[PDB]
Amino acid sequence: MREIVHIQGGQCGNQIGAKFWEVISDEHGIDPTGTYHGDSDLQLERINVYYNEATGGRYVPRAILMDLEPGTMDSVRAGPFGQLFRPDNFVFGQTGAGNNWAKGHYTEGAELIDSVLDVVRKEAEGCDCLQGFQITHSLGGGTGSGMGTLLISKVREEYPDRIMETFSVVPSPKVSDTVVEPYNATLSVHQLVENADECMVIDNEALYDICFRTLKLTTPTYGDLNHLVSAAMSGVTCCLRFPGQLNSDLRKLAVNLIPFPRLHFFMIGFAPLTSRGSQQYRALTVPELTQQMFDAKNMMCAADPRHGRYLTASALFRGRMSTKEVDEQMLNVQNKNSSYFVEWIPNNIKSSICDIPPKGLKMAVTFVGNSTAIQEMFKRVAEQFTAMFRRKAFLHWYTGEGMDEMEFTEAESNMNDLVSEYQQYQDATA
Amino acid sequence: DTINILLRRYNKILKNVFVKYSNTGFSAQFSNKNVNSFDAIKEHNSLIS
Amino acid sequence: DLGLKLAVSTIGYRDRYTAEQCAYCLDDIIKSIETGDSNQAFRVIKEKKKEEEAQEEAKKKYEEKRL
Amino acid sequence: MREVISIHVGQGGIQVGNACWELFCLEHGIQPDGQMPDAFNTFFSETGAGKHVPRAVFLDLEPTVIDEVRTGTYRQLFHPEQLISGKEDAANNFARGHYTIGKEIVDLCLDRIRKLADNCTGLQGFLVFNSVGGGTGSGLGSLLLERLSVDYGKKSKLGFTIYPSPQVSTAVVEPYNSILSTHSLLEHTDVAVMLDNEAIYDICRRNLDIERPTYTNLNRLIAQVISSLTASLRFDGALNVDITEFQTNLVPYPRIHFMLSSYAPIISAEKAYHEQLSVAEITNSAFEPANMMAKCDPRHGKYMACSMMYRGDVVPKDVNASIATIKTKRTIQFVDWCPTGFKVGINYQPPTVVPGGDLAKVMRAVCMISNSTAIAEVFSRLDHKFDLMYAKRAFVHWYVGEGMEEGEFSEAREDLAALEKDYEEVGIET
Amino acid sequence: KFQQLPLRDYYESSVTQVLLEGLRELGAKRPENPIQFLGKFLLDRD
Amino acid sequence: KFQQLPLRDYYESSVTQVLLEGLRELGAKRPENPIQFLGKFLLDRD
Amino acid sequence: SFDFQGFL
Ligand SMILES: Nc1nc2c(ncn2[C@@H]2O[C@H](COP(=O)(O)OP(=O)(O)OP(=O)(O)O)[C@@H](O)[C@H]2O)c(=O)[nH]1
Ligand SMILES: Nc1nc2c(ncn2[C@@H]2O[C@H](COP(=O)(O)OP(=O)(O)O)[C@@H](O)[C@H]2O)c(=O)[nH]1
Ligand SMILES: [Mg+2]
């Protein structure tokens, strides 16, 4: 019951999913052949959340994979746990977008999306009670940031009451791999605010910083960043698949973390994270988890959370632990940092406890906090956008496929209005 | 009268400064384990050392 | 802004949110009155897609003419 | 020929119902399978041959807790189709559980209530348990109380609500639905007992000497209080008290029926037997402000009426000799228009111990239910918390979009202001 | 479906075009009896 | 004079109170014919 | 330790 379907688009989203599904399968004891080989009874009670049942007793994820080029899905199939995905759900084009948002949203993405919407509708109509959808995509690419966001609007138009999740990677100015990143980032943020019920920003720069400083491993690769993102993704829905002292589905988090409908851009972090050589030194206790949870360097975004004030915060503890300690520590982390918490909403931290810890760990915490410090990312994105747009650089590529500069002006104005009205509440006082 | 007027004018600043510094000291007494009551935490947070 | 905020400030605290929503909405016709576009009262590719859909439909209609 | 029906709604309600139903089964000698290997009739019913069925119903929209109940050791006890379960949780939204999803479930609950009531012949009244700071709990409790008040009329209903702590909180939006639910049960419930978690945490820490308590330890104390309250209906005693003999002794006026409880002694077996536990010392400990079961200071207000239950080998003359001492003390003062304010009950059955629990076995115990003027502080602080966020209309869109009108928030505020004025008007001397 | 829409959405989906047209002419004509003129205009719009 | 006031000031000084009153009842009653009800309401206000 | 009045 109350299950969700998985939809991913683009190369970055496909690579994120290729590790997210591996993590989920390892958590539920599903072999790469789709056969259950788990140890505990609880591993099968709520498997309908992510997995479907077919004849022969094997399980198949309800994931939908889409891209405008076939290479990435032809590569993910040969990887581990690549056989679980149903071949029918693979939809792809023969041309690609070339990191051009217009091509992936107006000319090419519009004709292809009917086929993927057909299978999306097939998956949603069938399921017992829908909880919602979760979306993984990147804002630094053309086909992803175009087709995914248009699909968001199409899904929202047909299921207005369901919940919608988006895990979005925004292009940081530090590690830049594409010159046309500001254009399709700014165009995508315009559409994303209007339809997504929840959005979670993730930055490659913050992932590299975490890998270099906390884990202290010499050579980070995309596999480590994907693993961290996958652990963070799994931590959110853990209590929906396992029993606990205070169950809290996604809708309950939506109620408690979004004060106003347009303020739904969160930054997350996962604890504990320790190096291989120091994993024996540390002792896992609730104070040790909560001190690392609110650490500024532990956030999955380069945004500095002590440059603003938290509107609200959430924590999803895992493992068996006493609730009194959790509540007193949450109170203590809020009394010692009163300057960084907005004062006109008292008791702005939500807590939840799940009795099933991750495989290999005795305690774990997932942190989701809505803070005013996120304005800095939109500020720098808009700064680069307006630095590049004033000369009409690279504009002809977009304008040759039916798009105009008016949609750029409206997007810039709406993004600046969002930036302004997000900080409006930072200076608000009672 | 002039000091009381100034203290009223700047009361919001003085109260922000008071609240900012009143919880910055390391008191071993109020380490989270032995503060049995919310009232004791509230009383400590209302004092500056 | 002005004149509409002083009018919203004359409405009791229970209905002030509704009056603020009505004032934002009243901001809605005014822009149209000020300007002239009946599509600002809520919340390459577009043109091309519309054109293509119309053309296909037109061909079907042509087929209806053909019928 | 005397019966009572207990209603459990929400996660907290179900988790305290489990706690009370181990205790009752243990106290009446019934095994967890429901089989005995004439006092049971108050809580149970005979099936003709063999097992006993509790006169209780479990309600929740979120299925995890009920599924946990239906697989534990008590799977054979409860009737399979009185554990009503939903599919979608209200997610801490009060408007959801009062207007959207609770209405489709409330009819089945009312049918079950009728089917249980037709069996009873001497129905004393109803008991209801619900944690107030949640969507489904508060909303469904309000709707059930409103339906029962008109279906049955003058039958007595008792509510063991758990209000949020002064500063410790798990959610961020619980003041809104707490205020709305207080509005709903102010004109619909005959008795309401205060049960916030912080006071019981302090009790456990100081007396039981547990530094890491969980919810089970709290629920066991609540279960002991319930057993002490209802012992007089199913055991022989020198001075009996019935449920219907409350509004004539503790409720001076129809509006004022919120009172706070205390229990004594609370002590562990490691140091219980070193002291004699006389009746005088336990009745002194029960009146200590630090042993209140709700975090309120009785020294800040007058007393109106005290109803306090004993059980064990206590002799009435020793009780009178201790009531005199309390009347003597200068730190406890009663209201002017109440010369005598004590109602005393004496029972012979000593409290029963649960194996593996915290409390030890003792021959004397005292449970007090006291109505005092000092309770207005919790209302004032909840009102202050509510006003801070209602000034900017925060989180209101999550309620307006679930069918509730805009003006519904204001009238709850007006009723709380009326209640606070009434409490001040009553406490002044003539 | 107007009965299901919120108050603000209800007005914009029920009397949006009529109010815009009536107020537009009202501001342009500035009649001595704006209420009477607007009332008749609404009935004539239908 | 209303004719000299800007569009915003003109509406707020000419039809602000009437529109707010009509919208208030419109959102509370949610009639099937909001436009017709509002039009009659304006004429009745005078 | 001063209260807020002692701090003033
Ligand atoms: N004393 C006590 N309080 C609890 C317990 N569990 C939850 N609560 C309280 O209940 C409040 C929230 O309501 P819950 O009972 O957890 O959830 P709910 O009533 O089912 O409402 P939903 O969130 O919609 O499911 C929290 O603030 C807790 O303080 C418990 O086991 N014992
Ligand atoms: N975490 C992670 N990020 C990736 C990976 N591959 C690419 N990216 C990011 O995705 C961005 C490029 O997106 P792109 O591949 O063009 O998306 P597409 O246009 O939808 O195919 C780069 O800035 C990378 O930082 C990966 O395997 N893992
Ligand atoms: Mg619940």
What are residue A341's DSSP bridge partners? A310
E8: chain D residues, CB-CB within 8 Å: none
CA distance A76 to A380: 34
Closest CA to F8 of E27, B28, D34, A427: E27
Q: Which of D245, D377, D408, D420 is catalytic?
A: D245
Q: How far apart are CA A392 and CA D361, in angstroms?
A: 84
Positive or negative, the Cα torsion across F19, F20, F25, F31?
positive
Looking at the fold, whether D77 and D98 belong to one and the same domain comes out as: yes
Examine the fold and report which residue of D207, D239, D258 is the final residue of a domain before the chain moves on. D258
User: A13 CA distance to ligand 2 centroid (A)?
Assistant: 8
Do chain F and chain G touch with ≥3 beta carbon pairs under 8 Å?
no
**What separation in Å is there between the alpha carbon of A138 and the centre of ligand 2?**
7
How far is the C-alpha of D28 from the C-alpha of D47, rounded, in Å? 16
A421 is in an annotated binding site: no
From the CB coordinates, do chains G and C have 3 or more pairs under 8 Å? no
Where in the sequence is the domain holding D7, given as residue range(s)? 3-258
A429 is in an annotated binding site: no
Q: How far apart are alpha carbons D334 and D343 in whole angstroms? A: 14
Residue D422 near residue D256, CB atoms below 8 Å: yes
- Annotated binding residue at A414? no
Q: Which residues in chain B touch residue D206, judged by CB atoms under 8 angstroms apart?
A: 36
Nearest to residue D266, comparing CAs of D369, D162, D366, D368? D366
CATH number of the domain that residue D242 is part of: 3.40.50.1440
Q: Are residues D103 and D242 in the same domain?
A: yes
Cα D247 from Cα D100, distance rounded (Å): 35
In a shared domain, residues D249 and D318: no
D18 and D153, same domain (yes or no): yes
What SS3 string covers A118-142?
HHHHHHHHHCCCEEEEEEEEECCCH
Q: Which two tokens stand for residue D127?
A: 């008991």
* Dihedral angle over CA of A376, A377, A380, A382, nearest 10: -110
What secondary structure letter does DSSP report for D164? P
Which chain A residues contact residue D10 at CB under 8 A?
none
Residue ending a domain, among D334, D359, D377, is D377
Pair A225, A291: CB distance under 8 Å: no
Number of domains observed in the structure of chain D: 2
Contact with chain C for residue F17, Cβ under 8 A: yes
How many CA atoms does the CB half-sphere of A55 hold within 13 Å?
A: 0
**E6 close to D (CB below 8 A):** yes
**Nearest Cα to D263, choosing from D235, D221, D303, D302?**
D221
Token representation of residue A285: 């206790």
Which value, in Å, is the radius of gyration of the alpha carbons in chain F? 12
Residues in CB range of D50: below 8 A, 6 or more apart: D34, D35
Q: Token pair of D189, please?
A: 């419930």
What radius of gyration, in Å, describes the C-alpha atoms of chain C? 22
D401, part of any domain: no
To the query of whether residue D245 is one of the catalytic residues in this protein, the response is yes
Are the C-beta atoms of A309 and A341 separated by less than 8 Å?
yes
Residue of D85, D98, D162 with the most ligand 1 atoms within 8 Å of its CB, for mutation: D162
D234 & D272 share domain: no
Tell me the CA distances in angstroms from D217 to A204, A386, D69, D214, D221, one per residue in order: 45, 60, 18, 6, 7
CATH, range A3-256: 3.40.50.1440
Taking the CA of D17 as reference, the closest ligand is: 1
Give me the CATH number covering residue D294. Answer: 3.30.1330.20
Q: Which chain F residue has the Cα nearest residue C11?
A: F20
In-domain check, residue D137: yes
A323 annotated ligand-binding residue: no
Q: Which residues are CB-contacts of A342 (< 8 A; sequence separation ≥ 6)?
A: A309, A310, A311, A348, A372, A425, A426, A428
Q: Is residue D427 part of a domain?
A: no
D173 and D75, same structural domain?
yes
H or E element at residue D371: strand D364-372
A352 DSSP β-pair partners: A316
Same domain, D341 and D267: yes
Which residues between 369 and 388 in chain D have a beta carbon less than 8 angstroms from any beta carbon of chain B? none
Provide the strand spans (E) within A336-416: 349-354, 364-371
Which residues make beta-bridge pairs with D264?
D366
A111 Cα: distance to centroid of ligand 2 (angstroms): 24
Indicate whether D360 and D337 sit together in one domain.
yes
Interface of B with A in 6-45 (CB under 8 A): 19-20, 23, 32, 35, 38, 41, 45
Regarding chains B and C, contact by 3 or more CB pairs under 8 A is answered as: no
CA angle, D70 as apex, D67 and D76 as ends, to 5°?
175
Ligand 1 atom closest to Cα of residue D62: 25
Binding residues of D: 11, 62, 131, 135-136, 170, 197, 219
The CA distance from D240 to D236, in Å, is 8
Ligand 1 in contact with D134 (CB < 6 A)? Answer: yes
Helix or strand holding residue A242 (H, E)? none
Atom of ligand 2 nearest to the CA of A145: 20
C-beta of D92 in contact with ligand 1 (< 6 A): yes
Chain C residues lying within 8 Å of E11, measured CB to CB? 22, 25
Q: Is A98 marked within a binding site? A: no
Coarse DSSP helix, strand, coil percentages of chain D, rounded to the nearest 5 percent? 45, 20, 40
- Interface contact flag, A430 D391, Cβ < 8 Å: yes
Judge if the beta carbon of residue D196 lies within 6 A of ligand 1: no
Residue E4 CB coordination number (10 Å)? 9
Q: Where in chain A is the domain with CATH 3.30.1330.20?
A: 265-374
Is the preceding omega at residue A272 within 30 degrees of 0, hence cis? Answer: yes
- Whether A324 has its CB under 8 Å from any CB of chain B: the answer is no
Task: Look at residues D114, D191, D134, D112 and name the one whose alpha carbon lies nearest to residue D9.
Answer: D134
Name the nearest CA neighbour of D8 among D260, D209, D223. Answer: D223
Contacts of A334 in chain B (CB under 8 A): none
Q: Residue D149: count other Cβ atoms within 10 Å of its Cβ.
A: 16
What is the least distance, in Å, from the CA of D381 to any CA of chain C?
Answer: 21
Contact call for A312 and D172, based on CB within 8 A:
yes
Question: What single-letter amino acid sits at D197?
Answer: N
Q: Using the beta-carbon criterion (under 8 Å), do D88 and A129 form an inter-chain contact?
A: yes
Q: What would the two tokens of residue D277 be?
A: 């536990």
Closest-CA residue in chain B for G3?
B47
Our CA-based measurement puts residue B1 at a distance from the nearest CA of chain A, in whole angstroms, of: 28
Q: Which CATH class is domain A265-374?
A: alpha beta
Residue D59: strand pairing partners: D9, D84
At position A38, the amino acid (one-letter code) is G
Chains in contact with A, where contact means 3 or more Cβ–Cβ distances below 8 Å, are B, C, D
On chain D, the residues whose CB falls within 8 A of the CB of B42 are: 167
Residues 1-8 of G with CB under 8 A from B: 1-4, 6-8
- Check if the beta carbon of residue A81 is closer than 8 Å to that of residue A50: no
What's the order of all strands across the beta sheet hosting A3-9? A90-92, A63-67, A3-9, A130-138, A163-169, A198-202, A265-271, A364-371, A310-318, A349-354
B14, G8 Cβ separation under 8 angstroms: yes
For β-strands D364-372 and D258-264, DSSP reports them as antiparallel
Instruction: Locate CATH 3.40.50.1440 in chain A.
Output: 3-256
For residues D102 and D148, membership in a common domain is answered with yes
Apex CA D13: angle with CA D73 and CA D227, to 5°?
Answer: 75
Same domain, yes or no, for D240 and D367? no
CA distance D258 to D418: 15
| Same domain for D271 and D218 | no
CB atoms A335 and B32 under 8 Å: no
Q: Say if residue D201 is in the same domain as residue D104.
A: yes
- The verdict on the CB of residue D89 being under 6 Å from ligand 1 is yes
Q: Across A272-414, where does the E strand assignment appear? A: 310-318, 349-354, 364-371
Considering only the beta carbons, identify the residue of F14, F35, F45 that sits closest to E15: F35
Strand residue runs (E) in A245-373: 265-271, 310-318, 349-354, 364-371
Strand pairing of D123-131 and D3-9? parallel
Answer whether B35's CB lies under 8 Å from A336's CB.
no
Q: If you measure from the C-alpha of residue D136 to the centroid of ligand 1, how many angstroms do you get, rounded to a whole number? A: 10
Cβ pair D168:A346 closer than 8 A: no
Domain termination site, one of D224, D239, D258: D258
The answer to whether D242 touches D124, Cβ cutoff 8 Å, is yes
